[PDB]
């Protein structure tokens, strides 16, 4: 999603065709760090938001197409929104600074 | 809060 190479707001579950209600029938009630690609509308139509739910700080999140930059740059450079959020769904996103509190558990990729 | 929250 920037030029002809496809792989980081779109990767491998990351979708983006699923609205307020759609995501809330199979999401808040059982999910405590489960991560999915959810479409928004706000500044126009803006397909490509992640969003995780807690069951109790229930919050989304911003991808970007690879902006962020997280890893040993010398001969490949690193450039990924997602690297330094992916170190933090490895443990804890509260020790980052977004208070979720939560490890990666599982997408619900195509519903 | 379940619709946006931007964070990056």
């Given at each position: 999603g920037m030029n002809n190479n496809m792989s980081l707001q779109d990767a491998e579950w990351y979708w983006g065709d699923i609205s307020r209600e759609?995501?809330?029938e199979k999401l808040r009630d059982?999910?405590?760090?489960?991560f999915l690609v959810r479409d928004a509308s706000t500044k126009m139509?803006?397909?490509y938001t992640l969003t995780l739910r807690k069951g109790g700080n229930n919050k989304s999140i911003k991808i970007f197409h690879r902006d962020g930059k997280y890893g040993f740059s010398d001969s490949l450079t690193?450039?990924?929104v997602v690297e330094l959020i992916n170190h933090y769904r490895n443990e804890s996103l509260a020790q980052?600074?977004?208070k979720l509190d939560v490890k990666l558990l599982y997408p619900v990729s195509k519903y | 809060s379940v619709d946006y929250?931007?964070?990056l």
């Open positions: 759609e995501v809330n059982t999910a405590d760090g489960t139509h803006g397909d690193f450039n990924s980052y600074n977004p | 929250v931007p964070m």
